[PDB]
Amino acid sequence: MEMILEEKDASDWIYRGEGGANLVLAYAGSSPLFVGKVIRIQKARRNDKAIKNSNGVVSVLTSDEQHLWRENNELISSPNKEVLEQRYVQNVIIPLLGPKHVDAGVRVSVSKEFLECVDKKVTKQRPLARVNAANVDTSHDSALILNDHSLFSQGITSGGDCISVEIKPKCGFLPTSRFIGKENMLKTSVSRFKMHQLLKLEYIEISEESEYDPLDLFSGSKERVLEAIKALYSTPQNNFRVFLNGSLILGGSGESTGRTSPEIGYAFEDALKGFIQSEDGHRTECFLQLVSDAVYGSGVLDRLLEIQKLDKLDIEGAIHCYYDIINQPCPICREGRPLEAELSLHALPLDESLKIVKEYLIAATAKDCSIMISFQSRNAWDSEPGDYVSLKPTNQTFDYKVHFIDLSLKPLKRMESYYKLDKKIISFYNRKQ
Amino acid sequence: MEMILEEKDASDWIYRGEGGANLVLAYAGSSPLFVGKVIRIQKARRNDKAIKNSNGVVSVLTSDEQHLWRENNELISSPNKEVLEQRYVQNVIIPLLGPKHVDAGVRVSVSKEFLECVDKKVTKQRPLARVNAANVDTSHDSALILNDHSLFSQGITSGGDCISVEIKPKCGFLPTSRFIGKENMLKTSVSRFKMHQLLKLEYIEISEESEYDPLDLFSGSKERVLEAIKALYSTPQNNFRVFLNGSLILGGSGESTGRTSPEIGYAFEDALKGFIQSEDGHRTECFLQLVSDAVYGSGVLDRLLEIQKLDKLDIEGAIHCYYDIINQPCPICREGRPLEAELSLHALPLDESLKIVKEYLIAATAKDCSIMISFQSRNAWDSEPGDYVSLKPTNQTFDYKVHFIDLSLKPLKRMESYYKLDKKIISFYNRKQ
Numbered sequence A, B: 001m002e003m004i005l006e007e008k009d010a011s012d013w014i015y016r017g018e019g020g021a022n023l024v025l026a027y028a029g030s031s032p033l034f035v036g037k038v039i040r041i042q043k044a045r046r047n048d049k050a051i052k053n054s055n056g057v058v059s060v061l062t063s064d065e066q067h068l069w070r071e072n073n074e075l076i077s078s079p080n081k082e083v084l085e086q087r088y089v090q091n092v093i094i095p096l097l098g099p100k101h102v103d104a105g106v107r108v109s110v111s112k113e114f115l116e117c118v119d120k121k122v123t124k125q126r127p128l129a130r131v132n133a134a135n136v137d138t139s140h141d142s143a144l145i146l147n148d149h150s151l152f153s154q155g156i157t158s159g160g161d162c163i164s165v166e167i168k169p170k171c172g173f174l175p176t177s178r179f180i181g182k183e184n185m186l187k188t189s190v191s192r193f194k195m196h197q198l199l200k201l202e203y204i205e206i207s208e209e210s211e212y213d214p215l216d217l218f219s220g221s222k223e224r225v226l227e228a229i230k231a232l233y234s235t236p237q238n239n240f241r242v243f244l245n246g247s248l249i250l251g252g253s254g255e256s257t258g259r260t261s262p263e264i265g266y267a268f269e270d271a272l273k274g275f276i277q278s279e280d281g282h283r284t285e286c287f288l289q290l291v292s293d294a295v296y297g298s299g300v301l302d303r304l305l306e307i308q309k310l311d312k313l314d315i316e317g318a319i320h321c322y323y324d325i326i327n328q329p330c331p332i333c334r335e336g337r338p339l340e341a342e343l344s345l346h347a348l349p350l351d352e353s354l355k356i357v358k359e360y361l362i363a364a365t366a367k368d369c370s371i372m373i374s375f376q377s378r379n380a381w382d383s384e385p386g387d388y389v390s391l392k393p394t395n396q397t398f399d400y401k402v403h404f405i406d407l408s409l410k411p412l413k414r415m416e417s418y419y420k421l422d423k424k425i426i427s428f429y430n431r432k433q
């Protein structure tokens, strides 16, 4: 006993957003069971080689993956992808990031006709830019219900509007030189994000290089955190978005998003009215300081950075462990004269190779996730605040919550794509110098 | 949109029966959507090596199976076992047996709590003998709804009670000598069923050898069909059962079922009252003639026999093709001096080996299935009859329907068990001569 979302329930859900794997819809009906929740629904994807097995079947886990993730029997026994992703979050990620900032959600049964109805709705409600993107996978029979982290609470409080900020921080550290070739040494001093911006700029996938440096955001320095926030505001690309009661008021158009112009900046400043009690023109600066204080105060990025640091070898190192795992002769090692560093990796007992690659894929989850920080203004006539920021410049107090979203299990075969991409980025960056 | 069976729906379903893979419950509620339907629910089984992969995970299909069944992409893409079994019936079996006698059923969503509730119900309602048998697999989220083939129509007609007969016919032919060793030649002249009865009798799994000979039932001769029916009645074991409005009135206690005694025979004769219009003591003979006429008249066994004959090589031959398929050195061939017959099999192109093994597993489906024949007496004031039998001795007309049940996909790894079992049966039978 609980429930199934049917064709008749589709009308209660409205498009919120999407990424490469999922569609997200917000609840818009009346039931107290669902107010302030979102539903996450998996897209259909062929064209993705990493999720296929040797027979071209999209299996929950490949035999190689089952072997890699063997430590959690629960995980490898997942009968479908919805269960797999839920158990990965619950059993692998939550022990690392804690339950306070991670919602694994609740699985709900869905009918085929509910999903076909949603397919049609997202086609109508999508931005034009996304109309040909992959739609819902109507062969799945579960979906995931999660709290809406664009909201602090299910309903509006009298204090003000709920403003929520979403950050895709990317990788906050630089690899050591230990498994990196002499020709690729800039990797130890220039961030992956910065190097990638150069390639995106050459491929005209962005109108200009972002001002954002993840090394600032993860620096441990309040000034540098503020710098990162100001930068994200200026050039949001797909790294920064802001919601007013679950509605986009900054960013959200993919990495193609325009850099904040006077017009965009002006509308945003007015969108903050009431939320920040400051005169016209001054709220933006207060808002950026608030986000900065919440980010720094929460310490949430320190813990994420430690999981990102589970990438101990860099992909240039870990790819060798990958080949050992899948029991193939290593083509990296054929490319030229192998480092002693690399040979020692192949010398590793198979248990250590397994552990290294697993930890690399967990780190990839941490490098690719997002954080949603939701804020609720307090009335001066409320009692004392959980976590909060006090803005002296407006003498306002804001409760806040931080949640990690988009914490997905990365397919083992993606190690190959990760290697190729890294190779291309460093090759490109090197010749641009 | 359709529905989910929830905890509250459990009360509408009552235990009907079970075999090694499934629990079956009949609908007992009021909804016209379900009256005259049964629900088939998969049991949980560990202890079954054939359904595990190389990692001990119970996958929908192994990589080897995906390769074997590659011809139906639909089949190999099944996301779970309920879909797999439904698509196997629809896409593989129905083209061979026809849609008239095969109901693939309809998948229904089920909640975990519905299944946990059913678990508890079947524990209460099971015969004591079956209380420790595997119960429902509560990790599945679908079940199968099928028409109740113990019933001719959803409700009772005024003509009489519905009497339904269920036959597990077993294999109706003898292999050729082509891939059988000289030491095992009795296989070409004595049925697998007869030989197996000897082993069961030694292992005291039956109180006595059955009188039933499948070669009679599949003979094409009306007299021999009648002989088989009379034999099944005498010693039902697990091959013969009879239902009165969905309630057991003969057989049903496993292969351990007692041979029909005077007491059992007397109760059965009274259970037929009204159904067969014949004086006390004479209905049983009329009933057996009726079943015989329906079986022979329908021709249904001719078509089943042709699918059983898809076992072209015998397991003694096909096991060699199995080893080629899974890309292993053949241990059969190591056992002693291989036949030329066997060597030629290993010489086969891989496409022919694949086809042979597939056809063997389809034949295994046909050898292990059951047929349910349901009867409805016609009133003398009804119009002319679909398929029917006229009993002159009572001047009664009976409409009948025949359905194949228990048409399951056999796991590839079971080839190993099939070989071992065959080896044991022929070894035992040989030394008993």
Ligand SMILES: Nc1ncnc2c1ncn2[C@@H]1O[C@H](COP(=O)(O)OP(=O)(O)NP(=O)(O)O)[C@@H](O)[C@H]1O
Binding pocket: A016, A017, A018, A019, A020, A021, A022, A023, A024, A038, A146, A147, A148, A149, A150, A166, A368, A370, A405, A406, A408
């Ligand atoms: N719990 C949530 N509450 C509110 N909004 C959410 C939530 N989860 C996701 N979203 C929004 O929906 C968008 C897409 O969700 P996301 O989980 O990133 O999709 P995805 O396809 O699984 N990720 P990716 O594969 O990295 O492109 C996010 O960018 C958020 O704006």
Ligand SMILES: Nc1ncnc2c1ncn2[C@@H]1O[C@H](COP(=O)(O)OP(=O)(O)NP(=O)(O)O)[C@@H](O)[C@H]1O
Binding pocket: B016, B017, B018, B019, B020, B021, B022, B023, B024, B038, B146, B147, B148, B149, B150, B166, B368, B370, B405, B406, B408
């Ligand atoms: N459609 C149906 N209508 C009425 N009764 C049925 C139906 N299907 C199954 N049954 C009854 O339920 C019993 C068990 O079903 P069955 O499909 O044989 O279970 P199973 O576990 O999948 N077979 P097996 O693995 O060969 O032991 C049968 O012997 C029938 O008496």
Ligand SMILES: [Zn+2]
Binding pocket: A319, A320, A323, A330, A331, A332, A333, A342, A346
């Ligand atoms: Zn290598």
Ligand SMILES: [Zn+2]
Binding pocket: B319, B320, B323, B330, B331, B332, B333, B342, B346
């Ligand atoms: Zn052989």
